[PDB]
Symmetry: D2
Subunit: 117 residues, 4 copies
Protein backbone atom coordinates (compact mmCIF):
# COMPACT_ATOMS: atom_id res chain seq x y z
CA UNK A 1 0.00 0.00 0.00
CA UNK A 2 1.51 3.30 -1.13
CA UNK A 3 2.06 6.01 1.47
CA UNK A 4 2.54 9.43 -0.19
CA UNK A 5 4.08 11.12 2.87
CA UNK A 6 6.61 8.33 3.40
CA UNK A 7 7.68 8.61 -0.23
CA UNK A 8 7.85 12.42 0.02
CA UNK A 9 10.28 12.01 2.92
CA UNK A 10 12.25 9.35 1.06
CA UNK A 11 11.32 6.65 3.56
CA UNK A 12 11.39 3.06 2.32
CA UNK A 13 9.70 -0.04 3.72
CA UNK A 14 12.39 -2.70 4.17
CA UNK A 15 10.50 -5.49 5.90
CA UNK A 16 6.90 -6.23 6.81
CA UNK A 17 5.50 -9.15 8.82
CA UNK A 18 2.59 -9.83 11.18
CA UNK A 19 2.73 -7.11 13.84
CA UNK A 20 6.11 -5.75 12.74
CA UNK A 21 7.82 -3.48 10.23
CA UNK A 22 11.19 -1.93 9.46
CA UNK A 23 11.36 1.39 7.63
CA UNK A 24 14.55 3.09 6.47
CA UNK A 25 15.48 6.61 5.48
CA UNK A 26 18.22 9.22 5.33
CA UNK A 27 18.27 12.71 6.83
CA UNK A 28 18.32 15.13 3.89
CA UNK A 29 18.88 18.87 3.64
CA UNK A 30 15.10 19.39 3.54
CA UNK A 31 14.62 17.53 6.84
CA UNK A 32 16.71 19.90 8.95
CA UNK A 33 15.58 22.51 11.44
CA UNK A 34 17.14 25.98 11.75
CA UNK A 35 19.91 24.45 13.86
CA UNK A 36 21.26 22.11 11.20
CA UNK A 37 19.94 18.93 12.82
CA UNK A 38 17.10 16.55 11.90
CA UNK A 39 13.75 18.17 12.64
CA UNK A 40 11.79 16.42 15.39
CA UNK A 41 8.96 15.89 12.94
CA UNK A 42 11.12 13.89 10.54
CA UNK A 43 12.29 11.34 13.10
CA UNK A 44 8.71 11.10 14.36
CA UNK A 45 7.33 10.63 10.84
CA UNK A 46 9.83 7.81 10.31
CA UNK A 47 8.92 5.98 13.53
CA UNK A 48 5.21 6.67 13.02
CA UNK A 49 5.44 5.14 9.54
CA UNK A 50 6.92 1.86 10.81
CA UNK A 51 4.15 1.99 13.44
CA UNK A 52 1.44 2.49 10.81
CA UNK A 53 2.66 -0.43 8.69
CA UNK A 54 3.16 -2.87 11.56
CA UNK A 55 -0.24 -2.09 13.07
CA UNK A 56 -2.11 -2.41 9.79
CA UNK A 57 -0.85 -5.95 9.21
CA UNK A 58 -3.55 -6.84 11.76
CA UNK A 59 -6.36 -5.00 9.98
CA UNK A 60 -7.50 -1.37 9.54
CA UNK A 61 -6.01 0.81 12.27
CA UNK A 62 -5.35 4.51 12.90
CA UNK A 63 -2.94 6.30 15.25
CA UNK A 64 -4.57 7.09 18.60
CA UNK A 65 -1.84 8.10 21.07
CA UNK A 66 1.90 8.26 20.47
CA UNK A 67 4.96 9.26 22.48
CA UNK A 68 8.36 10.23 21.10
CA UNK A 69 11.46 10.40 23.29
CA UNK A 70 14.49 12.03 21.64
CA UNK A 71 17.98 10.94 22.74
CA UNK A 72 20.48 11.95 20.04
CA UNK A 73 20.52 14.67 17.37
CA UNK A 74 21.30 13.75 13.76
CA UNK A 75 22.71 15.73 10.88
CA UNK A 76 22.15 15.49 7.14
CA UNK A 77 23.52 12.31 5.60
CA UNK A 78 22.67 10.13 8.59
CA UNK A 79 21.12 6.78 7.67
CA UNK A 80 18.20 5.90 9.91
CA UNK A 81 16.04 2.83 10.57
CA UNK A 82 12.83 2.47 12.55
CA UNK A 83 11.88 -1.00 13.75
CA UNK A 84 8.37 -1.49 15.08
CA UNK A 85 7.47 -4.37 17.37
CA UNK A 86 4.07 -5.29 18.79
CA UNK A 87 3.91 -5.18 22.60
CA UNK A 88 0.16 -5.69 22.93
CA UNK A 89 -2.63 -6.80 20.63
CA UNK A 90 -6.24 -6.37 21.75
CA UNK A 91 -9.54 -6.48 19.90
CA UNK A 92 -9.99 -2.71 19.94
CA UNK A 93 -6.43 -1.42 20.30
CA UNK A 94 -2.79 -2.41 19.84
CA UNK A 95 0.46 -0.91 21.13
CA UNK A 96 3.88 -0.87 19.47
CA UNK A 97 7.41 0.04 20.47
CA UNK A 98 9.44 1.63 17.68
CA UNK A 99 13.18 2.11 18.02
CA UNK A 100 14.85 4.71 15.82
CA UNK A 101 18.45 3.72 15.17
CA UNK A 102 21.37 5.28 13.33
CA UNK A 103 24.74 3.53 13.07
CA UNK A 104 23.93 1.26 15.99
CA UNK A 105 22.86 4.09 18.30
CA UNK A 106 19.34 4.51 19.70
CA UNK A 107 18.40 7.97 18.42
CA UNK A 108 14.84 7.96 19.73
CA UNK A 109 12.16 5.77 21.28
CA UNK A 110 8.59 5.86 19.99
CA UNK A 111 5.60 4.28 21.74
CA UNK A 112 2.27 4.12 19.96
CA UNK A 113 -1.24 2.82 20.34
CA UNK A 114 -3.68 2.39 17.46
CA UNK A 115 -7.45 2.20 17.43
CA UNK A 116 -8.56 -0.85 15.43
CA UNK A 117 -11.46 0.15 13.17
Amino acid sequence: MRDPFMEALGLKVLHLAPGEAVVAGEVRADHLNLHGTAHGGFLYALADSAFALASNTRGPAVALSCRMDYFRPLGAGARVEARAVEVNLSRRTATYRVEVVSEGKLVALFTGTVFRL
Copy 2:
Protein backbone atom coordinates in the same frame (compact mmCIF):
# COMPACT_ATOMS: atom_id res chain seq x y z
CA ASP B 1 13.45 26.16 8.61
CA PRO B 2 14.10 23.69 5.75
CA PHE B 3 11.59 21.07 6.91
CA MET B 4 8.87 23.66 7.52
CA GLU B 5 9.39 25.07 4.03
CA ALA B 6 9.34 21.58 2.51
CA LEU B 7 6.01 20.88 4.22
CA GLY B 8 4.64 24.27 3.17
CA LEU B 9 4.16 25.48 6.75
CA LYS B 10 3.94 29.19 7.57
CA VAL B 11 4.50 31.00 10.86
CA LEU B 12 1.48 33.19 11.60
CA HIS B 13 2.25 34.44 15.07
CA LEU B 14 5.23 34.47 17.43
CA ALA B 15 5.32 36.02 20.89
CA PRO B 16 6.90 35.25 24.29
CA GLY B 17 6.19 31.59 24.98
CA GLU B 18 3.78 31.15 22.08
CA ALA B 19 3.56 30.45 18.37
CA VAL B 20 0.97 29.69 15.71
CA VAL B 21 1.84 27.80 12.53
CA ALA B 22 -0.46 27.03 9.61
CA GLY B 23 -0.44 24.67 6.67
CA GLU B 24 -2.62 22.75 4.27
CA VAL B 25 -2.88 19.02 3.73
CA ARG B 26 -1.56 18.33 0.22
CA ALA B 27 -1.59 15.11 -1.79
CA ASP B 28 1.97 14.38 -0.64
CA HIS B 29 0.92 14.57 3.03
CA LEU B 30 -1.50 11.64 2.96
CA ASN B 31 -0.84 8.22 4.47
CA LEU B 32 -1.67 4.72 3.21
CA HIS B 33 -5.32 5.36 4.13
CA GLY B 34 -5.62 8.51 2.06
CA THR B 35 -5.92 10.73 5.14
CA ALA B 36 -3.51 13.30 6.60
CA HIS B 37 -0.45 11.36 7.79
CA GLY B 38 -0.01 11.37 11.56
CA GLY B 39 3.59 12.42 10.98
CA PHE B 40 2.49 15.49 9.04
CA LEU B 41 0.12 16.66 11.77
CA TYR B 42 2.86 15.99 14.32
CA ALA B 43 5.44 17.91 12.28
CA LEU B 44 3.03 20.87 12.23
CA ALA B 45 2.46 20.76 16.00
CA ASP B 46 6.16 20.14 16.62
CA SER B 47 7.06 23.19 14.54
CA ALA B 48 4.91 25.53 16.66
CA PHE B 49 6.27 23.78 19.76
CA ALA B 50 9.85 24.41 18.61
CA LEU B 51 9.23 28.07 17.78
CA ALA B 52 7.37 28.76 21.02
CA SER B 53 10.05 27.18 23.20
CA ASN B 54 12.85 28.95 21.35
CA THR B 55 11.40 32.35 22.26
CA ARG B 56 12.77 31.56 25.74
CA GLY B 57 16.25 30.64 24.55
CA PRO B 58 17.93 27.55 23.02
CA ALA B 59 16.19 24.30 23.89
CA VAL B 60 16.07 20.68 22.77
CA ALA B 61 12.96 18.47 22.70
CA LEU B 62 12.95 15.60 25.19
CA SER B 63 9.51 13.98 25.13
CA CYS B 64 6.40 14.71 23.07
CA ARG B 65 2.93 13.18 22.98
CA MET B 66 0.36 13.34 20.23
CA ASP B 67 -3.29 12.32 20.60
CA TYR B 68 -5.34 12.08 17.39
CA PHE B 69 -9.06 12.90 17.44
CA ARG B 70 -10.26 13.53 13.89
CA PRO B 71 -8.93 12.51 10.46
CA LEU B 72 -8.34 15.08 7.71
CA GLY B 73 -8.33 14.82 3.93
CA ALA B 74 -6.35 16.59 1.24
CA GLY B 75 -7.18 20.29 1.02
CA ALA B 76 -7.89 20.69 4.73
CA ARG B 77 -6.52 23.89 6.24
CA VAL B 78 -4.77 23.16 9.52
CA GLU B 79 -3.24 25.24 12.28
CA ALA B 80 -1.11 24.49 15.35
CA ARG B 81 -1.43 26.80 18.38
CA ALA B 82 1.35 26.52 20.96
CA VAL B 83 1.02 27.78 24.53
CA GLU B 84 3.44 27.54 27.43
CA VAL B 85 2.20 25.35 30.31
CA ASN B 86 5.32 25.41 32.49
CA LEU B 87 8.63 27.26 32.39
CA SER B 88 11.51 26.36 34.68
CA ARG B 89 15.24 27.06 34.57
CA ARG B 90 16.14 23.77 32.88
CA THR B 91 12.88 22.66 31.25
CA ALA B 92 9.66 23.90 29.68
CA THR B 93 6.43 22.23 28.63
CA TYR B 94 3.98 23.31 25.96
CA ARG B 95 0.51 22.32 24.86
CA VAL B 96 -0.16 22.53 21.13
CA GLU B 97 -3.67 22.26 19.74
CA VAL B 98 -4.00 21.21 16.10
CA VAL B 99 -7.22 22.65 14.70
CA SER B 100 -9.08 22.63 11.39
CA GLU B 101 -12.25 24.63 10.71
CA GLY B 102 -13.09 25.05 14.38
CA LYS B 103 -12.53 21.39 15.26
CA LEU B 104 -9.79 20.00 17.51
CA VAL B 105 -7.92 17.58 15.25
CA ALA B 106 -5.18 16.57 17.66
CA LEU B 107 -3.53 17.48 20.96
CA PHE B 108 0.24 17.65 21.36
CA THR B 109 2.12 17.93 24.66
CA GLY B 110 5.86 18.52 24.62
CA THR B 111 8.72 19.13 27.02
CA VAL B 112 12.14 20.56 26.20
CA PHE B 113 15.47 20.78 27.99
CA ARG B 114 16.67 24.38 28.14
CA LEU B 115 20.30 24.92 27.15
Copy 3:
Protein backbone atom coordinates in the same frame (compact mmCIF):
# COMPACT_ATOMS: atom_id res chain seq x y z
CA ASP C 1 -13.46 3.63 45.32
CA PRO C 2 -11.22 1.61 47.71
CA PHE C 3 -7.93 3.10 46.49
CA MET C 4 -9.19 6.69 46.69
CA GLU C 5 -10.34 6.07 50.25
CA ALA C 6 -7.05 4.40 51.13
CA LEU C 7 -5.22 7.50 49.87
CA GLY C 8 -7.62 9.82 51.71
CA LEU C 9 -8.82 11.46 48.50
CA LYS C 10 -12.06 13.47 48.38
CA VAL C 11 -14.32 14.33 45.44
CA LEU C 12 -14.95 18.08 45.46
CA HIS C 13 -16.79 18.40 42.15
CA LEU C 14 -18.35 16.09 39.57
CA ALA C 15 -20.18 17.10 36.39
CA PRO C 16 -20.57 15.81 32.83
CA GLY C 17 -17.03 15.44 31.50
CA GLU C 18 -15.35 16.91 34.57
CA ALA C 19 -14.23 16.22 38.12
CA VAL C 20 -12.10 17.64 40.89
CA VAL C 21 -10.43 15.38 43.44
CA ALA C 22 -8.52 16.67 46.45
CA GLY C 23 -6.10 15.22 48.96
CA GLU C 24 -3.25 16.07 51.29
CA VAL C 25 0.28 14.72 51.09
CA ARG C 26 0.68 12.59 54.22
CA ALA C 27 3.84 11.01 55.63
CA ASP C 28 2.94 7.72 53.95
CA HIS C 29 2.69 9.47 50.56
CA LEU C 30 6.37 10.45 50.37
CA ASN C 31 9.11 8.91 48.25
CA LEU C 32 12.71 8.14 49.23
CA HIS C 33 13.57 11.84 48.83
CA GLY C 34 11.01 13.11 51.33
CA THR C 35 8.76 14.65 48.69
CA ALA C 36 5.34 13.65 47.37
CA HIS C 37 5.74 10.33 45.56
CA GLY C 38 5.15 10.60 41.82
CA GLY C 39 2.74 7.70 42.15
CA PHE C 40 0.62 9.56 44.71
CA LEU C 41 0.31 12.65 42.50
CA TYR C 42 -0.51 10.37 39.57
CA ALA C 43 -3.08 8.41 41.58
CA LEU C 44 -4.79 11.72 42.37
CA ALA C 45 -4.88 12.87 38.74
CA ASP C 46 -5.85 9.38 37.55
CA SER C 47 -8.77 9.36 40.00
CA ALA C 48 -10.18 12.68 38.71
CA PHE C 49 -9.58 11.30 35.21
CA ALA C 50 -11.52 8.11 36.02
CA LEU C 51 -14.43 9.99 37.60
CA ALA C 52 -14.67 12.55 34.80
CA SER C 53 -14.60 9.90 32.06
CA ASN C 54 -17.15 7.65 33.76
CA THR C 55 -19.71 10.48 33.78
CA ARG C 56 -20.08 9.60 30.09
CA GLY C 57 -20.57 5.91 30.77
CA PRO C 58 -18.32 2.85 31.30
CA ALA C 59 -14.78 3.36 30.03
CA VAL C 60 -11.31 1.86 30.37
CA ALA C 61 -8.08 3.85 30.49
CA LEU C 62 -5.77 3.26 27.52
CA SER C 63 -2.84 5.68 27.73
CA CYS C 64 -1.92 8.39 30.23
CA ARG C 65 0.96 10.87 30.39
CA MET C 66 2.17 12.62 33.51
CA ASP C 67 4.45 15.66 33.36
CA TYR C 68 5.98 16.77 36.69
CA PHE C 69 6.83 20.44 37.24
CA ARG C 70 7.27 21.05 40.97
CA PRO C 71 7.94 18.88 44.04
CA LEU C 72 5.64 18.91 47.09
CA GLY C 73 6.31 18.25 50.76
CA ALA C 74 4.31 16.56 53.50
CA GLY C 75 1.24 18.59 54.42
CA ALA C 76 0.66 20.07 50.98
CA ARG C 77 -2.99 20.41 49.95
CA VAL C 78 -3.37 19.13 46.40
CA GLU C 79 -6.16 19.10 43.81
CA ALA C 80 -6.57 17.30 40.49
CA ARG C 81 -8.88 19.19 38.12
CA ALA C 82 -9.99 17.14 35.12
CA VAL C 83 -11.65 18.57 32.01
CA GLU C 84 -12.76 16.84 28.84
CA VAL C 85 -10.75 17.88 25.78
CA ASN C 86 -12.34 15.44 23.33
CA LEU C 87 -15.29 13.08 23.18
CA SER C 88 -16.06 10.57 20.44
CA ARG C 89 -18.35 7.55 20.20
CA ARG C 90 -15.67 5.14 21.43
CA THR C 91 -12.98 7.35 22.98
CA ALA C 92 -12.53 10.37 25.23
CA THR C 93 -9.48 12.37 26.26
CA TYR C 94 -8.95 14.43 29.39
CA ARG C 95 -6.53 17.05 30.65
CA VAL C 96 -5.98 16.97 34.39
CA GLU C 97 -4.13 19.79 36.11
CA VAL C 98 -2.60 18.91 39.49
CA VAL C 99 -2.33 22.04 41.62
CA SER C 100 -1.22 22.94 45.14
CA GLU C 101 -1.35 26.37 46.77
CA GLY C 102 -1.75 28.14 43.44
CA LYS C 103 1.03 26.31 41.60
CA LEU C 104 0.71 23.89 38.67
CA VAL C 105 2.54 20.88 40.12
CA ALA C 106 1.89 18.50 37.24
CA LEU C 107 -0.09 18.00 34.04
CA PHE C 108 -1.86 14.73 33.26
CA THR C 109 -3.27 13.76 29.85
CA GLY C 110 -5.31 10.60 29.43
CA THR C 111 -7.46 8.75 26.94
CA VAL C 112 -10.08 6.07 27.54
CA PHE C 113 -11.96 3.64 25.34
CA ARG C 114 -15.71 4.04 25.88
CA LEU C 115 -17.48 0.73 26.47
Copy 4:
Protein backbone atom coordinates in the same frame (compact mmCIF):
# COMPACT_ATOMS: atom_id res chain seq x y z
CA ARG D 1 13.20 3.47 52.31
CA ASP D 2 10.10 4.66 50.44
CA PRO D 3 6.99 5.37 52.57
CA PHE D 4 4.50 5.22 49.69
CA MET D 5 5.95 1.94 48.41
CA GLU D 6 5.56 0.43 51.88
CA ALA D 7 2.03 1.81 52.22
CA LEU D 8 1.15 -0.04 49.00
CA GLY D 9 2.88 -3.22 50.15
CA LEU D 10 5.46 -3.09 47.36
CA LYS D 11 8.77 -4.93 47.84
CA VAL D 12 12.13 -4.32 46.18
CA LEU D 13 13.23 -7.67 44.74
CA HIS D 14 16.36 -6.41 43.03
CA LEU D 15 18.37 -3.23 42.62
CA ALA D 16 21.44 -2.81 40.40
CA PRO D 17 23.05 -0.04 38.31
CA GLY D 18 20.33 1.33 36.04
CA GLU D 19 17.91 -1.47 36.93
CA ALA D 20 15.24 -2.40 39.47
CA VAL D 21 12.55 -5.00 40.11
CA VAL D 22 9.64 -4.24 42.41
CA ALA D 23 6.86 -6.69 43.23
CA GLY D 24 3.55 -6.62 45.03
CA GLU D 25 0.05 -8.03 45.21
CA VAL D 26 -3.24 -6.36 44.37
CA ARG D 27 -5.09 -5.94 47.67
CA ALA D 28 -8.65 -4.89 48.48
CA ASP D 29 -7.44 -1.33 49.10
CA HIS D 30 -5.91 -1.13 45.61
CA LEU D 31 -9.16 -1.67 43.72
CA ASN D 32 -11.23 0.90 41.85
CA LEU D 33 -15.03 1.09 41.89
CA HIS D 34 -15.14 -1.56 39.16
CA GLY D 35 -13.43 -4.19 41.30
CA THR D 36 -10.12 -4.22 39.41
CA ALA D 37 -6.68 -2.81 40.23
CA HIS D 38 -6.81 1.00 40.20
CA GLY D 39 -4.75 2.59 37.43
CA GLY D 40 -2.95 4.57 40.11
CA PHE D 41 -1.76 1.42 41.85
CA LEU D 42 -0.24 -0.12 38.72
CA TYR D 43 1.36 3.20 37.84
CA ALA D 44 2.72 3.57 41.38
CA LEU D 45 4.33 0.15 41.04
CA ALA D 46 5.95 1.01 37.71
CA ASP D 47 6.92 4.48 38.92
CA SER D 48 8.59 2.97 41.99
CA ALA D 49 10.84 0.65 39.96
CA PHE D 50 11.52 3.63 37.67
CA ALA D 51 12.51 5.88 40.59
CA LEU D 52 14.83 3.28 42.11
CA ALA D 53 16.55 2.33 38.84
CA SER D 54 17.06 5.97 37.88
CA ASN D 55 18.50 6.96 41.26
CA THR D 56 21.22 4.30 41.10
CA ARG D 57 22.94 6.70 38.69
CA GLY D 58 22.67 9.59 41.13
CA PRO D 59 19.87 11.90 42.35
CA ALA D 60 17.18 12.23 39.71
CA VAL D 61 13.60 13.45 39.45
CA ALA D 62 10.82 12.40 37.09
CA LEU D 63 10.00 14.71 34.20
CA SER D 64 7.57 12.85 31.94
CA CYS D 65 6.06 9.38 32.19
CA ARG D 66 3.63 7.43 30.01
CA MET D 67 1.49 4.51 31.11
CA ASP D 68 -0.22 2.18 28.65
CA TYR D 69 -2.76 -0.25 30.17
CA PHE D 70 -3.36 -3.65 28.52
CA ARG D 71 -4.95 -6.06 31.00
CA PRO D 72 -7.10 -5.58 34.10
CA LEU D 73 -6.14 -7.34 37.33
CA GLY D 74 -8.24 -8.53 40.24
CA ALA D 75 -7.50 -8.72 43.95
CA GLY D 76 -4.96 -11.40 44.81
CA ALA D 77 -3.05 -10.99 41.55
CA ARG D 78 0.71 -11.05 41.98
CA VAL D 79 2.45 -8.34 40.00
CA GLU D 80 6.01 -7.17 39.38
CA ALA D 81 7.65 -4.35 37.44
CA ARG D 82 11.11 -4.38 35.94
CA ALA D 83 12.77 -1.09 35.07
CA VAL D 84 15.49 -1.18 32.41
CA GLU D 85 17.60 1.77 31.25
CA VAL D 86 16.95 2.67 27.60
CA ASN D 87 19.05 5.82 27.41
CA LEU D 88 21.55 7.47 29.73
CA SER D 89 22.64 11.04 29.00
CA ARG D 90 24.51 13.51 31.20
CA ARG D 91 21.38 15.52 32.02
CA THR D 92 18.60 12.98 31.49
CA ALA D 93 17.84 9.26 31.40
CA THR D 94 14.93 7.22 30.07
CA TYR D 95 13.60 3.90 31.32
CA ARG D 96 11.25 1.18 30.10
CA VAL D 97 9.19 -0.47 32.83
CA GLU D 98 7.24 -3.62 32.03
CA VAL D 99 4.43 -4.46 34.44
CA VAL D 100 3.72 -8.18 34.41
CA SER D 101 1.53 -10.76 36.10
CA GLU D 102 1.93 -14.49 35.51
CA GLY D 103 4.15 -13.93 32.49
CA LYS D 104 1.78 -11.53 30.72
CA LEU D 105 2.40 -7.85 30.02
CA VAL D 106 -0.26 -5.99 32.02
CA ALA D 107 1.02 -2.50 31.27
CA LEU D 108 3.96 -0.66 29.75
CA PHE D 109 5.53 2.37 31.43
CA THR D 110 8.06 4.75 29.84
CA GLY D 111 9.75 7.44 31.89
CA THR D 112 12.38 10.14 31.62
CA VAL D 113 14.20 11.77 34.53
CA PHE D 114 16.26 14.92 34.95
CA ARG D 115 19.63 14.06 36.51
CA LEU D 116 20.63 16.52 39.23
